[PDB]
Paper text:
Highly conductive AtSLAC1 WT showed predominantly the open conformation, whereas less conductive AtSLAC1 7D and 8D exhibited mostly the closed conformation. Both closed and open states are nearly identical to those of 6D. By contrast, the cryo-EM map of AtSLAC1 8D exhibited a clear density for the latch with the sequence of 105DF(S107D)MFRTK112, revealing features for unequivocal modeling: an apparent N-terminal direction due to a right-helical turn and side chain orientation; readily discernible densities of the aromatic amino acid pattern (F/Y)xx(F/Y)R; distinct density of the phosphomimetic mutation S107D compared to that of the corresponding S107 in the AtSLAC1 S59A31. The latch binds to both TMD and the plug with a buried surface area (BSA) of 522.7 Å2. The binding of latch is expected to stabilize the plug by increasing interface between TMD and ICD (plug and latch) from 1176.8 Å2 to 1446.9 Å2 BSA. In the N-terminal half of the latch sequence motif, aromatic residues F106 and F109 in the latch interact with both the plug and TMD at once, with larger BSAs (121.31 Å2 and 179.19 Å2) than other residues.
Slow anion channel associated 1 (SLAC1) is a slow (S)-type anion channel that generates anion (Cl- and nitrate) efflux on the guard cell plasma membrane and acts as a key effector of stomatal closure. Trimeric SLAC1 harbors N-terminal and C-terminal intracellular domains (ICDs) with the transmembrane domain (TMD) positioned in the middle. Multiple serine/threonine phosphorylation in the N-terminal and C-terminal intracellular domains activates SLAC120,21,27,28.
Numbering used by the authors:
A (entry chain A), B (entry chain C), C (entry chain B): 105 to 112, 148 to 516
């Protein structure tokens, strides 16, 4: 009954995924579709654990970077924040990463057919890049107590975390520019921004190890693929529910890239110039359009994907503290504090609601029917 | 007979507009379409006054900026032009703006159903931005006689004219990036450039009031939406007559944005550097392609839209006088004079022909049948 | 039998070319198509000489620039290369250009109907720009022995070679932005990059004659048309074989433009800054993706188009020697030598195989059936 997904269902085209699945994330089966697995009896645990549980790590590792700059930035020195907030968040986020990583490796050893189904899913494919972006955020945020009294980190740290990321993006980018079944015009969705943001995060790590020329190379590659993905989202593409007819929290993924580019540019050249200010000012316009409404707060439903919509907001807050240093004053101090407060509050709500579902309602790991769709209809 | 358009016809999709209307501006009914109003008997005056009469103001307020720089620029000081040309043009343009604004407000108070029809017209929608761009050109061009002996203008002038413009563009830009019925790929036309040029014109006004950081923010937003609209016009879009098969005066709208960006960049940083020279040199290439032909002059027919094709040519002339200051010489003096002469001559022809039609042929306000199309066919 | 192609078959739409032709270059007739000429009897010689024999000149004139920098660059002065390699290659390439040019002029005087068929071919149209790019490479590479002891060249050389190129691109670019039958979305192919690279090559020549402002203007125009052609190749276009489903040597045409822009920028401003490093670093990423595989070498078949895939690789090597001067060291010396060796080896293989086919197998000038397709089907 469950032996088809066990380790030893051919690769289904992305068109079938868009035709049989509905929703902003393609995680629900339509009403005329038949699945290959039972719909009522509980499934094995390792078959209902999605690849999207790595988004919790992205939401906690990005909050450690923010609180290290708050307690050390010259623009925030009027308040006195203890350095122990970064220590606690940095240790807590590391524990969660190890638990999520160890559980997914077990699934690959026992259920490898289900892992291949998620790889070919047009939306879930971008979450195979997130395991390495969480490790780069944790390395540019190490608590001073644990850091050696040296100016630079060992270059071997950059090679171990940016190696697999570069290998994966070499294959994916080649497919985009070709005329195959998996070209950008056939798969491009709002979540396709996770395969670009990792170029700018790795540029910061390269500078911190003493390799400035390598950082410049990674900035140029991330810049060429963000404009292709940014202009491609305004054209006519496959019809589906991956593009909500109204403004919906999924559009926050368009802010991560510009904010990280501004932060990465200021670290390579030492100053917040006309390039970082343009990157920072593009991401700030998008922040207002998505957050300056009243339905953004009134309409809020819990989901595991919510953990992936908060990390692009905590990154825009890190770039606002760098901008306040280049332009000292009261207009900039208030802007930095306002964005930081909103991001932290959004993460506190998700923390409480996640525990209530797990140990008070027991509805956090339902069956994953989106991976049992038929290949032919 | 006329009570359906009176103040108290549902919102028709942009597809219906493209299917029932023909021409470079979508102002004529096809030969198989039926209208909802009489086609022979004269209509009420307020029902045949379009929103495109604000283009006359754009053609006269942009000519006052040119003649203030001609009499004050160091590169033009060999000729001796009286400062009284700017005074006369500046006062004349203000009178026309007040008369056009007061007449359209009356239509909204008595015929509000016809105003909503123009708002949803894919081409006429961009002319709701023009009432504020005419007021910003008049504020950066005030005749010295009326100006106070101070270095900066009061910041309240910027807030009163750029406030409504920012509010309107927040709503429109949000629709472009969503998956609704009014996304750019469904409505994008050559006239869609009027909703972007106002970001660069407001950046100049911000600098003149002492707010340089605000000007930089408005430059970044205008730059992100011009590349989306510039690359989107080369793709496959709804089939209609909004894109002439040959070069036609409507393509002059592609020059306004690059010329204003170069002028706005030189005011924020004080020098004509490698950014202003690239913006200026892109707009100059387009000027030659559209004006260096012989059919541009042989084929000329009077229209009220002609008043909206001249303002992008008078702006390219203002950027040519700024460039002549950074590069003094005879090659630059001749270039500035040549472009200025052509723009002024084009506006003199429209001035005489407009009066002849009004008081010698009485054919300037025909019935507007493009707003009476049926919603269902 | 051959009188229809003789000098005195209407202009066939680009759609017919894509529907009746197959292959990465549109040079083979499909299996259900009928031709207008005999398929077995040998044709006249002047009717089987394509416009793509000018690609041999591009492969030999670009190799003279490389070997002049190797013997004169400060970064390569540890090795001692004789200046006589540039002299021999420069003289040999000039002889080939004169022979190819004289043969094609004869065809136009006797077979003008076949020349018009190649002009309207969506792929062969871009090879009408190559006759002038070969003359600009030969003028920025003149052997010192033949050069006058002056700092600058005569400006008349720039006018005679860049005049015809500018005239041709004025007409083509106008068609792209219009709504006609030959707009970019209807014809855009990988070979469309040859009509843009000539703007950057002419900028270098302008600087060498003392006209720096003219060079800046040509850089801005080439930059605006490369982003349109670069983003347009990721959209949904006419279905055909012009876009191979896998990585194929034809994709090397995407490297020529970025490499020449970096070289041209360093000559206008004197230094390899953050603009040349971004252009250079984008072209280097594409080089790895196309050359760092094992099927690039195992799968190699001789073709006359191979001569047009090597010139974009010899240009990326010229930009690597300029970068090694701005960043002296051993990491940069090895990179420059590695790319130069590969480009030279690829050209030596094509040289031997071209002579074997001509005088050992007699299969170098087959009948050109792609120009005899019917216009109606
Ligand atoms: C990467 C994503 C987030 C997009 C945001 C930035 C980009 C759109 C790039 C492309 C063009 C760049 C601008 C183009 C040219 C310049 C001039 C550049 O060099 C100068 O000439 C110095 C000017 C000065 O500061 O005086 C200063 C930065 C700036 C404005 C650039 C800022 C960054 C821009 C907007
Ligand atoms: C806004 C519309 C009208 C488009 C026209 C301008 C843009 C296409 C931007 C994006 C990239 C920019 C260029 C990219 C990088 C630079 C380097 C920039 O910074 C430097 O490195 C200084 C170089 C120098 O002047 O020495 C100088 C301006 C320039 C050429 C920029 C000019 C403005 C460009 C062409
Ligand atoms: C032409 C093709 C091959 C594309 C490759 C280059 C372009 C994508 C342009 C557009 C935006 C440009 C960049 C945008 C802004 C700048 C800042 C510009 O001006 C500065 O502010 C100086 C910064 C410094 O060097 O300190 C320096 C070059 C650079 C990075 C530009 C490099 C060239 C870019 C990437
Ligand atoms: Cl950081
Ligand atoms: Cl001004
Ligand atoms: Cl050279």
């Amino acid at each position: 009954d469950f032996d088809m997904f066990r380790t030893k269902n051919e690769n289904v085209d992305a068109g079938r995924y868009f035709a049989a699945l509905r929703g902003p994330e393609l995680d629900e089966v339509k009403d005329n579709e038949d699945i290959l697995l039972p719909k009522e009896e509980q499934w094995p645990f390792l078959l209902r654990f999605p690849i999207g549980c790595f988004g919790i790590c992205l939401g906690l590792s990005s909050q450690a970077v923010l609180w290290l700059a708050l307690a050390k930035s010259p623009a925030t020195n009027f308040l006195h924040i203890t350095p122990l907030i970064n220590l606690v968040v940095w240790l807590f986020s590391l524990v969660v990463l190890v638990s999520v990583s160890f559980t997914y490796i077990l699934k690959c050893i026992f259920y490898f057919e289900a892992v291949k189904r998620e790889y070919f899913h047009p939306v879930r494919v971008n979450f195979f890049f997130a395991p390495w972006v969480v490790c780069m955020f944790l390395a540019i945020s190490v608590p001073p107590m644990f850091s050696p009294n040296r100016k630079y980190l060992h270059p071997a740290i950059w090679c171990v975390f940016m190696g697999p990321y570069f290998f994966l993006e070499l294959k994916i980018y080649g497919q985009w520019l070709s005329g195959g079944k998996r070209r950008l015009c056939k798969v491009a969705n709002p979540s396709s921004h996770l395969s670009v943001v990792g170029n700018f995060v790795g540029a910061i790590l390269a500078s911190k190890v003493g390799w400035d020329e390598v950082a410049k190379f990674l900035w140029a590659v991330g810049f060429a693929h963000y404009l292709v993905v940014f202009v491609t989202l305004y054209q006519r593409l496959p019809t589906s529910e991956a593009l909500p007819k109204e403004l919906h929290p999924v559009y926050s993924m368009f802010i991560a890239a510009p904010s990280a580019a501004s932060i990465a540019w200021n670290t390579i050249y030492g100053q917040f110039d006309g390039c970082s200010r343009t990157c920072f000012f593009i991401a700030l316009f998008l922040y207002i359009s998505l957050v300056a409404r009243i339905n953004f707060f009134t309409g809020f439903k819990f989901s595991v994907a919510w953990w992936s919509y908060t990390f692009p907001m905590t990154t825009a807050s890190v770039a606002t503290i760098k901008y306040a240093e280049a332009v000292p004053g009261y207009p900039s101090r208030a802007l930095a504090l306002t964005l930081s407060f909103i991001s932290t509050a959004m993460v506190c709500v998700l923390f409480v609601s996640t525990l209530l579902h797990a140990f008070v309602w027991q509805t956090l790991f339902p069956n994953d029917l989106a991976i049992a769709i038929t290949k032919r209809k």
